[PDB]
Design an enzyme around this catalytic site. Structure first.
Site, PDB file in Angstrom:
ATOM      1  N   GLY A  14       0.883  -1.223  -0.031  1.00 43.86           N
ATOM      2  CA  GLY A  14       0.004   0.069  -0.082  1.00 43.86           C
ATOM      3  C   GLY A  14       1.056   1.181  -0.057  1.00 43.86           C
ATOM      4  N   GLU A  15       0.317   2.266  -0.559  1.00 47.92           N
ATOM      5  CA  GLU A  15       1.070   3.453  -0.563  1.00 47.92           C
ATOM      6  C   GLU A  15       0.168   4.698  -0.837  1.00 47.92           C
ATOM      7  N   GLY A  16      -0.383   5.188   0.447  1.00 49.61           N
ATOM      8  CA  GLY A  16      -1.304   6.320   0.604  1.00 49.61           C
ATOM      9  C   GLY A  16      -0.447   7.744   0.814  1.00 49.61           C
ATOM     10  N   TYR A  18       0.071   8.624   4.106  1.00 49.43           N
ATOM     11  CA  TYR A  18       1.285   8.056   4.930  1.00 49.43           C
ATOM     12  C   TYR A  18       2.197   7.183   4.228  1.00 49.43           C
ATOM     13  N   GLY A  19       3.011   7.481   3.427  1.00 50.30           N
ATOM     14  CA  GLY A  19       4.481   6.885   2.800  1.00 50.30           C
ATOM     15  C   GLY A  19       3.845   5.688   2.236  1.00 50.30           C
ATOM     16  CB  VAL A  21       2.065  -0.907   4.259  1.00 49.94           C
ATOM     17  CG1 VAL A  21       2.143  -2.287   4.542  1.00 49.94           C
ATOM     18  CG2 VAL A  21       1.296   0.147   5.075  1.00 49.94           C
ATOM     19  CG  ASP A 123     -11.199   5.422   6.276  1.00 53.40           C
ATOM     20  OD1 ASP A 123     -12.175   5.771   5.595  1.00 53.40           O
ATOM     21  OD2 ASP A 123     -10.169   5.172   5.662  1.00 53.40           O
TER      22      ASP A 123
HETATM   23  C1  LIG Z   1      -1.725  -2.654   3.818  1.00 51.71           C
HETATM   24  N1  LIG Z   1      -1.318  -3.214   4.933  1.00 51.71           N
HETATM   25  C2  LIG Z   1      -1.296  -4.278   5.572  1.00 51.71           C
HETATM   26  N2  LIG Z   1      -1.143  -5.191   4.727  1.00 51.71           N
HETATM   27  C3  LIG Z   1      -0.960  -6.464   4.907  1.00 51.71           C
HETATM   28  N3  LIG Z   1      -1.102  -7.493   4.298  1.00 51.71           N
HETATM   29  C4  LIG Z   1      -1.401  -7.545   2.880  1.00 51.71           C
HETATM   30  C5  LIG Z   1      -2.122  -6.508   2.164  1.00 51.71           C
HETATM   31  N4  LIG Z   1      -2.211  -6.883   0.955  1.00 51.71           N
HETATM   32  C6  LIG Z   1      -2.950  -6.014  -0.088  1.00 51.71           C
HETATM   33  C7  LIG Z   1      -3.793  -6.946  -0.924  1.00 51.71           C
HETATM   34  C8  LIG Z   1      -3.516  -4.720   0.212  1.00 51.71           C
HETATM   35  C9  LIG Z   1      -1.716  -5.501  -1.102  1.00 51.71           C
HETATM   36  N5  LIG Z   1      -1.003  -5.314  -1.833  1.00 51.71           N
HETATM   37  N6  LIG Z   1      -1.497  -8.060   0.689  1.00 51.71           N
HETATM   38  C10 LIG Z   1      -1.213  -8.409   1.954  1.00 51.71           C
HETATM   39  C11 LIG Z   1      -0.274  -9.636   1.970  1.00 51.71           C
HETATM   40  N7  LIG Z   1      -0.823  -6.808   6.415  1.00 51.71           N
HETATM   41  C12 LIG Z   1      -0.565  -5.618   7.254  1.00 51.71           C
HETATM   42  C13 LIG Z   1      -0.920  -4.612   6.910  1.00 51.71           C
HETATM   43  C14 LIG Z   1      -0.769  -3.466   7.917  1.00 51.71           C
HETATM   44  F1  LIG Z   1      -0.530  -3.939   9.056  1.00 51.71           F
HETATM   45  F2  LIG Z   1       0.131  -2.206   7.721  1.00 51.71           F
HETATM   46  F3  LIG Z   1      -2.232  -2.899   7.972  1.00 51.71           F
END
Ligand SMILES: CNc1nc(Nc2cn(C(C)(C)C#N)nc2C)ncc1C(F)(F)F
Ligand SMILES: [Cl-]
Ligand SMILES: [Cl-]
Length: 263
Positions: A14-16, A18-19, A21, A123
């Site tokens: 993810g990339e919103g 807030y930088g 993930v 949210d």
């Molecule tokens: C986005 N934040 C988090 N995402 C995960 N796991 C995860 C998200 N994705 C998606 C489908 C969104 C993608 N790309 N795929 C996985 C394996 N775990 C934890 C987090 C957290 F903790 F940061 F919320």
């Protein structure tokens, strides 16, 4: 491949605002976690971290800890290796009703927990509902979350935030409002998405014709005509405009569909 001490940052999750993930893999132990990276150059993160450290429940994302390294904060959380609920929703279809029911039970368990420690998420939507390897739901992203109860005293909210198709109508129309019924409403929009693969309106203002249609009980329209009468009777109690008349979670848990055996 970037890194943080023992962790390789191996994939963007993810990339919103807030930088980003990143999926982080420890080169020694091979443990996989999620890491939220915030470039503080680009008060809020002090709060988020304080809230994250409170969270201890099977249906809420666990916080492992944080590292500052200059302007960059690293937030270490439980990885949900199943990804998001968003990706289990087939557009225009939803998902099998038994899967929707199980996810809704888990979402209620997570929300009862947060509300019971005086935290509102603000949210709730399928993007923020993640799945572990066993498909257990996890409420994620505490960046809009806030305290609504402290020393057993409730405080009303006044800040408008969330995502328009998921926000309760009082949040557009009132100077101040109760936190709990807002999170309940967004749970009802998530349930609608799961059973119909479609959101009912852009926003619940009666400048929105789909919202008026729902208030006038026109359930022969989409998305409502895709939804069996039992879960639809629950959505009739959740998607109530007056937040004082809206069903509370204790009463959701007495609902006929909520307690209906499904497979
Ligand atoms: C986005 N934040 C988090 N995402 C995960 N796991 C995860 C998200 N994705 C998606 C489908 C969104 C993608 N790309 N795929 C996985 C394996 N775990 C934890 C987090 C957290 F903790 F940061 F919320
Ligand atoms: Cl879509
Ligand atoms: Cl959807």
């Amino acid at each position: 491949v970037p890194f943080v001490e023992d962790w390789d940052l191996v994939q963007t999750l993810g990339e919103g605002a807030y930088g980003e993930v990143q999926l982080a893999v420890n080169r020694v132990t091979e443990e996989a976690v999620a890491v939220k990276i915030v470039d503080m150059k680009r008060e809020n993160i002090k709060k988020e971290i304080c809230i994250l450290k409170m969270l201890n429940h099977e249906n809420v994302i666990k916080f492992y800890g944080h590292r500052r390294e200059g302007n960059i904060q690293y937030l270490f959380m439980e990885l949900a290796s199943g990804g998001s609920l968003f990706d289990r929703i087939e557009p225009d279809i939803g998902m099998p009703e038994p899967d929707a029911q199980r996810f809704f039970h888990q979402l209620m368990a997570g929300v009862v927990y947060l509300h019971g420690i005086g935290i509102t998420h603000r949210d709730i939507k399928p993007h923020n509902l993640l799945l572990d390897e066993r498909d257990n739901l996890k409420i994620a992203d505490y960046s809009l979350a806030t305290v609504f109860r402290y020393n057993n005293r409730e405080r009303l909210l006044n800040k408008m935030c969330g995502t328009l198709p998921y926000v309760a109508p009082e949040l557009l129309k009132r100077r101040e409002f109760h936190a709990e019924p807002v999170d309940v409403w967004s749970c009802g929009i998530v349930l609608t998405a799961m059973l119909a693969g479609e959101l009912p309106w852009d926003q619940p203002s009666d400048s929105c014709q789909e919202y008026s249609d729902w208030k006038e009980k026109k359930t022969y329209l989409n998305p409502w005509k895709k939804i069996d009468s039992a879960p639809l009777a629950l959505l009739h109690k959740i998607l109530v405009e007056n937040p004082s008349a809206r069903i509370t979670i204790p009463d959701i848990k007495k609902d006929r569909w909520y307690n209906k055996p499904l497979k």
